[PDB]
């Protein structure tokens, strides 16, 4: 909470540029520490202290934590013998502004005309995402803009999106009940660039990813869930065994469990008894909670699985083993499948695209 | 070294390159500019981090006692006093505890003169091994008011008028004497402040008082009422008002320079810690209520018992970080000491904790190096502005299974915890009154006046005369007269003369009782070490060689000698232009220097006209020992002083040295001050 | 009434019962206690709200200029100055703007003496109808340093030594003169502070200067370089150092009481606002760079042109809320004015905004009554500590469809917005350097010294002699002499005498004999003696008091403040000898018959310190004041070795003394009583 970042925390060998956003940040971060720490000595706090040593003629201030020896706290001075001494580019490893930087032109309250294109690179970014990745962007916009009560603002938003892509504006306009505007091709283009997409690449490792194992205290499901858990942990996964209560080997109750906590959900064999009938109706958890966890995990694109007879749990929510990211069969097959699925992480086959 | 613990926070910049406050070597003598004669750039991070720290240097001055100075030292107990207190720092003979002491005035702001007339603060912190114990005292044993809720009224009335902020550091204005006359409990402290206690010669020449009755408590819970006393081993000594006034202009740092010089020269000042001890069942047995802070306990009823000695022998390294930032509290109490139901002390406990939030602008001020105890802090406090530690215990609450019970409760029988005096009780109705035992506002002011010497009494009357003559309102002055008349009809009569008001007796509280230990001028000093002699000389003739030999012999006795002349020739410490009699405790004219007291040598571009005659005149008129060697006798003659007057020494070097050193013990020669009735025909 | 807008925040407690800060009538003279002699209860909410507020009264003093006093007034424009500036408060003849001015010293803390020797602040706020415009000036036209990044260095060196915090409000110590000699740009302001400008008689007797070159800008963007000047209508007047030292102890409030009294008695002080105006192309035309704040522009090259007059006629009602809390800023600029590339001014703009965060502990200090503009505040700032308004505009951002564009942008053409001078350009490399045109630190100090009268020069010599003699380090004193030698060989030699050192050989590089007008104090008599003060030394015995009353009545007819002094406060006596000192008066007059307290029995009363009447008269003579005695009282003058034929000493009948004293007060200080080297 106390650490105080600053873009002006710069060292020899680095300099700024005339980026007008950066320029004002340098002022704002120093000044704002005076509010958050109500004093000028916040760099003396342990988490803010440098390791290299502080030697200057600053004194006093609220919460002054040091006692300075040098009583000639000024420069230049004969009485301190020139110490602390000036450092620059040539002596003392001092900071220095880049020697070649020049100023030229009128003092202005303006921005360079070179800044005026606000649409090309939004179009470039959208172009460089996968089709369902693109649909995530449009569905975010659809959700967000649907909260705007003012009609004119919504049309203003559409007018601006239409300058990025006519198809984006058309697809957002449907959610808003607004007309598809006519193409404004000035900034349209089809170029792509690497390194901006998330969903076009599988994960380099699955270590620390979380597997929820839905089990039950009745029968022999928990012993199988423990065996499933110990194998998954060998790959560096964090595995939570879930049941009706905290029996031996249970990490969490159904009452406290949610699919949002896990990157994969697998039903232990025998636990299909909590997905329909009497085992699904219990005072120890909200009605339908095990089915809701599997439904959530499926609908949010996670790897989902069931071992042996627990395939019935997949059937009870209309999910088929045919599907990508869905695994059934015996334990070793489900383990290998779930582990492969975590590399994919999100199975975008389960998300509808406009006109698909 | 009493400052030893502070060495881990000390910063040495010698031999180093300049840096920012976040590291990185820099230059910070030129702003970054857009072109040769261009404007300064916002990206000059070096400029802004430099000037931001400058712009935020100041913190609020103390709401009272803003003006003062302090030093580190050692307290040594003279014995194992566990028969009267469980306090650790008093638990063994020759047990040593580091101290810090700050002295101060009260009314004036941070930059006002040391030699204003005022009550003086005398605050000691003991860094004991069972926490910080503070005795936040004054150089006067009684306070103005009886209930802490009245403190803003007193302080508002003696501080400057709120419309023009006039006058600085002075009680000599309408509102102060309106309050003194409307709130007669104030008359006792007023008399003390009108005496030598109001204009002491130095911090080292003051006694100190806790004022309040406190309690000492033993391990088994038995208690005794106690008054704290500091007895100066340098002797009490005071100026005269007409000299203190000039000194306020010539050297506003007179007292803080005095203490700093005494410590640097190896003449560390000392005070003995002494107590008066009273049985609980005798709290109301000495003619007043010992809960009443407007009273002191006469030593004839309970004598002083010395417990130990404090010696102040280290100056601070950075005044701001140590002296300005230190936060005294009467709530800084330890096992073996307890409070009393004194209604003034009661509210102080709240007020000194609260005011730290204003001065330090955060609740972690006890983490400042000068405020930290040496004994260790272990509790469940967390966060706060400027939190300087990183706590390991994540279970920051009690009671708790998870933290195993630690940090654990300490009380009377476990962990040497603090405990309130076990026998203390409350009885009666909740009330907004004061006990009728507090009613007498005049008897002890009269006892104090009765116990001063005749010229000392005249100093008191002349201070009131000076102060009350500044009161513009006629009725306030008459109100002051009526209240003074209740203490002493003669005092009221003699004050009335100066005010042009009419002199009748009101004898309800009159009496003739005296008590010891409240006078200053009835006793000579036990040592003249560190006292200052100004040797007036000249650069023409042989006077300087003689002045140097005079200085040499005087310095052998521990005196600080300043040889003065027209310019800084070899052997001269100060010029006449820069010299004034207020800086010295005695003035000696070196032989031959009589040439600068008349004729050509007295009119020179190098110093103001008449300056050597003025230094000698001031010195004589202010009661100092004055002297002239050999032919310099003529300088005494030129100002009309005779060679055989008390405290005047003429003759050869050896007898002058001897006479001056004897006169420094007397310190002030009071036959030079007229007393009412002296001028009658 | 200049204070009219402040009347809605004034609070009258007369006729009322005491309350808490949250309402409810209370008593607050007794703590709540458990039993008759019992402990105070935590539930005494009355006690804690009263003491909490007292406990938190103090705010940090100003980092510099901590010691000062101020007043309200009116500024009146003498003309329509639209030909040189778009500034609205200068836009019509007889246009009136409320002002508040604070005067100050620099080094001392809040309780330090007014008559310490120092540079003096002279800060003026115009509450214009287009925002607050501050001229944050000094009583001296040049500053110590050339780049704002060196301000902590200067101030640390002048302020008390950081080990013991000694000395208070004084440059007379090692670190300051080490700095003056290590940083030679400081010598010009140093000389000014060593002159009468360092010990002025009153705030009302100081000129004022913006110091920096600014720009005036017309509606069409044309600009002129400008120097701001305040010219006192009371005349410039100074004390002598040996007098200012005594006055520092006898009345630390000498200057703040002088201004308070003058306003309260109907003697409102006035200053004329005047400018020097030069073209852009003159920035380096006069042998120095006009961006250099260690140089002033001689009036021979550009004369003063008066624009209007300011008169201070209202004292504050609450010092703290008005004088203490007011926050000046050179950034308080309005349309029609612009900055220059003065590297000292440049950094001030950052510093005064930032420091308010420390002094007021929050971002809303402009909302305080003394800081508020009269022209209205409309922007999208919100929240912050102590937010005192309730904003109606919920769309607190721009640009925005939903707020319909309001508040709207204002610039040169729309809405009378501020605008930077359109022709200003930047050229060259980013640099941490100063222009070589800033190099000469000695010519103008010499010019200043050359332009003082011979005794006025001795005062500067004797100030340096006094100051430098406190420097304990031998080499620093030698470095001082080497730097003084570059200004004047004679100055160095005369200074070296007091130091017992040998002055270096002449260094003629910067020597010259040029003089310039308007920088001297003692070469001009005072234009008015109104508000000047006469101490009348009388006695209660005999008929002296009646004559002193008649002498007082006649003197008051010429606008003088008269204090009749005697042994005690008899009828007609203003002050006792015990309370009196010569520092309080501009002239001292012994009333006939009062010679009886200068010798014999009458001089030995217990009612005052020995010799007090003779010391008052002695002090007044030696400090250069007009002194006089009526009739038989000339024995008092003879008792101190002074005689009637001297300049500024008057004797004879009452009619003769009054006429002589009043004309002597115009001269103010008689310089024939001060010895000059040689
Ligand atoms: C016997 C009565 C009193 C004595 C001997 C006394 C003594 C002192 C002393 C010596 C100081 C300055 C300590 C230092 O040098 O830092 C001080 C400060 C102070 N006093 Fe008192 N005082 C008394 C009464 C009171 C009362 C009744 C109150 C309020 C209820 C009060 C409130 C304060 C405050 C708020 C400070 C400022 C503390 C700080 O800023 O650190 N005093 N007092
Ligand atoms: C020509 C040069 C300067 C002049 C004429 C000048 C004048 C003044 C004056 C008159 C005040 C007192 C305002 C008042 O009465 O409240 C003041 C205060 C102050 N000055 Fe300057 N000064 C100068 C240089 C500087 C510089 C170079 C800096 C820093 C870069 C600086 C920083 C400050 C600050 C921080 C205050 C305190 C303001 C406040 O607390 O409200 N000054 N100055
Ligand atoms: O300043």
Q: Between the CA of residue B456 and those of B114, B194, B478, B622, what are the distances in Å? A: 21, 10, 24, 14
Q: Report d(CA A221, CA A213) in Å as an integer.
A: 11
Kind plus residue range of the DSSP H or E element containing B69: strand B68-77
Residues 6+ apart with CB under 8 A from B472: B174
Least Cα distance to B487 among B193, B187, B198 occurs for B187
Q: Any bridge partners for residue C308, and if so which?
A: C77, C273
* Ordered strands of the C575-576 beta sheet: C575-576, C561-566, C533-537, C587-590, C627-630, C649-652
Q: C409 at the A interface (CB within 8 A)?
A: no
Catalytic residue among B132, B138, B197, B485: B138
Residues 93-152 of chain B with CB under 8 A from chain A are none
Least Cα distance to C569 among C605, C545, C600 occurs for C545
Query: What letter does residue C9 receive in the DSSP assignment?
Result: G
Distance B57 CA to ligand 3 centre (A): 14
Q: Report d(CA C104, CA C326) in Å as an integer.
A: 13
3-state SS assignment for residue B75: strand
Kind plus residue range of the DSSP H or E element containing C136: strand C131-138
Any idea of the CA torsion for A144, A149, A150, A151, to the nearest 10 degrees? 80
Judge whether C623 and C201 are in contact, CB under 8 Å. no
Determine how β-strand C425-431 pairs with β-strand A102-106. Answer: antiparallel
Judge whether A11 and B24 are in contact, CB under 8 Å. yes
Query: What letter does residue B670 receive in the DSSP assignment?
Result: G
Across the interface, whether the CB atoms of C40 and B354 are under 8 A apart is answered no
Identify how the structure was determined.
X-ray
CA-based torsion, B194, B195, B197, B202: positive or negative:
positive
Largest alpha-carbon pair distance within chain B? 93
Determine how β-strand B223-232 pairs with β-strand B208-209. Answer: antiparallel
Long-range pairs for C572-577: beta carbons < 8 A, 24 or more residues apart: C572/C545, C572/C546, C572/C548, C573/B500, C573/C538, C573/C540, C573/C545, C575/B469, C576/B465, C576/B466, C576/B469, C576/B498, C576/C607, C576/C608, C577/C607, C577/C608, C577/C612, C577/C613, C577/C616
Judge whether B85 and B218 are in contact, CB under 8 Å. yes
Q: Between the CA of residue C361 and those of A31, B358, B513, C213, C332, what are the distances in Å? A: 13, 11, 55, 32, 20
Distance B210 CA to ligand 1 centre (A): 11
Structure tokens at B614: 């003025």
Across the interface, whether the CB atoms of C35 and B431 are under 8 A apart is answered yes
Q: Which residues of C254-272 are buried (b: 16+ CB within 10 A; e: fewer)?
A: bbbbbbbbbbeeebbbbbb
CA-proximal residue: ligand 1, atom 4 (nearest): B137
Structure tokens at A96: 């220095």
Q: Report d(CA C480, CA C194) in Å as an integer.
A: 14
Angle at alpha carbon of residue B297, lines to B296 and B300, rounded to 5°: 140
Q: Report d(CA C37, CA B340) in Å as an integer.
A: 10
Strands (DSSP E) found in C233-324 = 270-278, 305-314
Q: Alpha helices of C361-514 — where are they, by DSSP H?
A: 443-450, 454-468, 474-487, 489-499
**Residue B401 CB neighbours (<10 A):** 7
Q: Report d(CA C610, CA B317) in Å as an integer.
A: 43
Considering the domain delimited by A108-205, tell me its CATH architecture.
Up-down Bundle (1.20)
Q: Work out the minimum CA distance from A162 to partner chain C, whole angstroms.
A: 18
Considering the domain delimited by A206-356, tell me its CATH architecture.
3-Layer(aba) Sandwich (3.40)
Domains in chain B with CATH codes: 1-430 (2.40.180.10), 431-527 (1.20.1370.20), 528-681 (3.40.50.880)
**Residue B264 CB neighbours (<10 A):** 12
Q: Report d(CA C442, CA C653) in Å as an integer.
A: 53
* Tokens 């209202």 found at: C314
CA-proximal residue: ligand 2, atom 31 (nearest): C348
Identify the burial level of A312 via C-beta atoms within 10 angstroms of its C-beta, where 0-12 means exposed, 13-18 middle and 19 or more buried. Answer: middle
The binding-site residues of ligand 2, defined as CB within 6 angstroms of any ligand atom, are B 51, 55; C 62-65, 68, 102, 104, 121, 123, 136-138, 143, 148, 151, 211-212, 293, 327-328, 344, 347-348, 351-352, 355-356, 359
Judge whether B333 and B84 are in contact, CB under 8 Å. no
3-state SS assignment for residue A5: coil
C65 is catalytic: yes
Q: Between the CA of residue C496 and those of B583, B611, B665, C464, what are the distances in Å? A: 25, 21, 40, 10
CA-proximal residue: ligand 3, atom 1 (nearest): C64
* Tokens 């000014």 found at: C192
C360 is catalytic: no
When scoring A34, A68, A99 by the number of chain B Cβ atoms within 10 A, the one with the most, hence best to mutate, is A68
Q: Report d(CA A94, CA A98) in Å as an integer.
A: 12
Ligand 3 pocket check for C123: Cβ under 6 Å: no
Structure tokens at B363: 């609740």
Which of A9, A45, A66 lies nearest to residue B11, judging by beta carbons?
A: A66
Q: Any bridge partners for residue C273, and if so which?
A: C230, C308
CA-based torsion, C256, C262, C265, C269: positive or negative:
negative
State the chains in contact with B (3 or more Cβ–Cβ pairs under 8 Å).
A, C
Q: Report d(CA C230, CA C273) in Å as an integer.
A: 5
What φ, ψ does residue C151 adopt, rounded to 5°?
Answer: -60, -45
Angle at alpha carbon of residue B113, lines to B108 and B116, rounded to 5°: 75
The binding-site residues of ligand 1, defined as CB within 6 angstroms of any ligand atom, are B 62-65, 68, 102, 104, 121, 123, 136-138, 143, 148, 151, 211-212, 293, 327-328, 344, 347-348, 351-352, 355, 359; C 51, 55
Is residue C479 left, alpha or beta, with left meaning phi > 0 and alpha meaning psi from -120 to 50?
Answer: alpha
Q: Report d(CA B623, CA B644) in Å as an integer.
A: 15
CA-proximal residue: ligand 1, atom 29 (nearest): B348
Query: What letter does residue B320 receive in the DSSP assignment?
Result: I
Ligand 3 pocket check for C481: Cβ under 6 Å: no
Determine how β-strand C575-576 pairs with β-strand C587-590. Answer: unpaired
Q: Work out the minimum CA distance from A73 to partner chain C, whole angstroms.
A: 6
Across the interface, whether the CB atoms of C153 and A75 are under 8 A apart is answered yes
Judge whether C180 and C495 are in contact, CB under 8 Å. no
Judge whether C74 and C309 are in contact, CB under 8 Å. no
Q: Between the CA of residue C306 and those of A78, B91, B109, C57, what are the distances in Å? A: 45, 78, 40, 43
Q: Which residues of B586-607 are buried (b: 16+ CB within 10 A; e: fewer)?
A: bbbbbbbbbbbbeeebbebbbb
Query: What letter does residue C320 receive in the DSSP assignment?
Result: I
Is residue A341 left, alpha or beta, with left meaning phi > 0 and alpha meaning psi from -120 to 50?
Answer: alpha
Judge whether C565 and C580 are in contact, CB under 8 Å. yes
Omega within 30 of 0 (cis) for the link into B407: yes
Judge whether C533 and C665 are in contact, CB under 8 Å. no
């Amino acid at each position: 909470e106390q650490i105080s970042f600053q873009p002006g925390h710069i060292v020899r060998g680095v300099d700024f540029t005339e980026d007008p956003l950066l320029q004002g940040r340098l002022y704002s971060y120093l000044d704002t520490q005076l509010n958050r720490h109500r004093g000028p000595n916040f760099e003396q706090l342990p988490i803010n202290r440098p390791v290299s040593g502080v030697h200057n003629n600053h004194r006093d201030g609220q919460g002054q934590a040091w006692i300075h020896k040098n009583i000639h706290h000024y420069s230049p001075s004969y009485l301190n013998k020139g110490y602390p001494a000036q450092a620059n580019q040539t002596v003392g490893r001092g900071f220095f502004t880049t020697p070649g930087r020049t100023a030229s032109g009128v003092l202005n309250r303006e921005l360079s005309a070179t800044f005026d294109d606000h649409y090309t690179q939004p179009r470039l970014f959208f172009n460089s995402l996968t089709p369902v990745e693109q649909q995530f962007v449009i569905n975010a916009i659809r959700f967000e803009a649907s909260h705007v009560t003012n009609e004119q603002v919504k049309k203003n938003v559409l007018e601006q999106l239409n300058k990025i892509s006519n198809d984006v504006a058309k697809r957002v306009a449907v959610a808003l009940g607004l007309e598809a505007p006519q193409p404004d091709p000035t900034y349209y283009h089809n170029n792509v660039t690497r390194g901006v997409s998330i969903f076009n690449e599988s994960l380099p490792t699955i270590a620390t990813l979380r597997v929820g194992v839905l089990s039950t205290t009745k029968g022999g499901s928990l012993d199988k869930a423990k065996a499933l858990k110990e194998q998954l942990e060998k790959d560096g996964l964090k595995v939570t065994v879930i049941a009706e209560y905290l029996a031996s080997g249970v990490d969490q109750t159904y009452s406290a469990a949610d699919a949002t906590a896990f990157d994969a959900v697998v039903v232990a064999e025998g636990a299909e008894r909590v997905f329909s009938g009497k085992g699904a109706m219990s005072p120890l958890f909200p009605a339908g909670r095990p089915s809701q966890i599997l439904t959530d995990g499926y609908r949010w694109g996670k790897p989902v699985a069931a071992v042996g007879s627990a395939k019935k749990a997949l059937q009870s929510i209309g999910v088929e083993e045919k599907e990508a990211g869905v695994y059934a069969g015996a334990q070793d097959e489900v383990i290998k499948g779930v582990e492969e699925g975590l590399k994919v992480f999100k199975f975008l086959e389960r998300f509808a695209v406009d006109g698909d | 070294d009493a400052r030893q613990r502070l060495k881990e926070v000390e910063v040495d910049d010698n031999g180093q390159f300049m840096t920012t406050d976040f590291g990185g070597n820099i230059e910070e003598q030129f702003s970054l500019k857009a072109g040769g004669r261009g404007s300064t750039l916002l990206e000059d991070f070096i400029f802004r981090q430099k000037l931001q720290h400058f712009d935020h240097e100041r913190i609020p001055e103390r709401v009272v006692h803003a003006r003062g100075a302090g030093a580190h030292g050692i307290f040594t107990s003279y014995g194992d006093w566990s028969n009267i207190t469980a306090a650790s720092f008093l638990g063994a003979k020759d047990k040593q505890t580091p101290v810090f002491v700050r002295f101060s005035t009260v009314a004036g702001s941070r930059g006002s003169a040391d030699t204003a007339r005022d009550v003086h603060g005398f605050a000691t912190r003991f860094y004991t091994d069972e926490g910080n114990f503070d005795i936040v005292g004054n150089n006067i044993p009684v306070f103005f008011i009886q209930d802490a809720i009245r403190f803003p009224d007193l302080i508002h009335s003696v501080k400057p008028s709120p419309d023009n902020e006039v006058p600085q550091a002075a009680t000599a204005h309408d509102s102060a004497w309106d309050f003194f006359s409307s709130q007669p409990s104030a008359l006792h402290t007023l008399f003390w402040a009108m005496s030598g206690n109001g204009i002491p010669r130095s911090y080292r020449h003051m006694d100190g008082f806790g004022i309040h009755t406190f309690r000492l408590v033993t391990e088994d819970g038995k208690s005794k009422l106690v008054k704290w006393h500091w007895k100066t081993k340098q002797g009490k000594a005071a100026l005269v008002w007409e000299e203190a006034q000039v000194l306020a202009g010539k050297n506003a740092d007179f007292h803080r320079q005095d203490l700093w010089d005494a410590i640097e020269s190896g003449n560390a000042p000392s005070w003995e810690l002494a107590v008066q001890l009273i049985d609980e069942d005798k709290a109301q047995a000495y003619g007043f209520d010992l809960l009443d802070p407007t009273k002191f306990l006469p030593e004839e009823f309970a004598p002083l018992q010395v417990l130990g000695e404090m010696t102040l022998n280290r100056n601070p390294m950075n005044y701001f970080a140590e002296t300005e930032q230190i936060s005294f509290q009467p709530g800084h109490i330890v096992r073996g000491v307890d409070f009393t139901e004194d209604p003034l002390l009661q509210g102080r406990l709240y007020s000194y904790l609260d005011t730290q939030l204003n001065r330090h602008r955060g609740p972690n001020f006890e983490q400042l190096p000068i405020n930290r105890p040496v004994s260790g802090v272990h509790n469940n406090h967390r966060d706060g502005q400027g939190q300087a530690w990183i706590h390991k215990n994540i279970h920051h609450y009690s009671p708790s299974y998870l933290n195993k019970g630690y940090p654990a409760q300490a009380n009377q029988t476990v962990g040497r915890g603090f405990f309130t005096t076990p026998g203390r009780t409350a009885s009666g109705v909740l009330n907004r009154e004061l006990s009728a035992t507090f009613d007498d506002h005049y008897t002890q002011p009269r006892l104090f006046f009765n116990s001063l010497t005749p010229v000392e009494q005249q100093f008191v009357i002349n201070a009131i005369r000076f102060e009350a003559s500044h009161v513009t309102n006629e009725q306030v002055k008459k109100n002051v007269l009526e209240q003074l008349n209740k203490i002493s009809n003669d005092v009221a009569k003699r004050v009335a003369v100066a005010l042009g008001l009419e002199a009748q007796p009101d004898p309800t509280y009159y009496h003739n009782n005296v008590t010891r230990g409240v006078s200053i001028f009835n006793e000579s000093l036990p040592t003249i070490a560190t006292l200052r002699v100004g040797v007036l000389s000249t650069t023409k003739g042989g006077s300087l060689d003689k002045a140097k030999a005079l200085k040499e012999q005087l310095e052998k006795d521990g005196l600080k000698v300043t040889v003065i002349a027209e310019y800084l020739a070899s052997g001269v410490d100060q010029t006449y232009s820069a010299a004034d009699a207020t800086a010295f405790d005695a003035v000696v004219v070196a032989e031959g220097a009589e040439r600068v007291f008349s004729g050509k040598g007295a009119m020179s571009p190098l110093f103001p006209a008449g300056r050597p005659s003025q230094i000698l005149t001031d010195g004589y008129r202010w009661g100092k020992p004055v002297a002239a060697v050999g032919s310099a006798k003529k300088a005494l003659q030129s100002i009309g002083v005779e060679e055989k007057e008390a405290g005047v020494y003429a003759g050869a070097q050896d007898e002058v040295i001897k006479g001056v050193e004897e006169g420094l013990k007397v310190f002030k020669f009071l036959e030079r001050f007229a007393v009412d009735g002296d001028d009658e025909e």
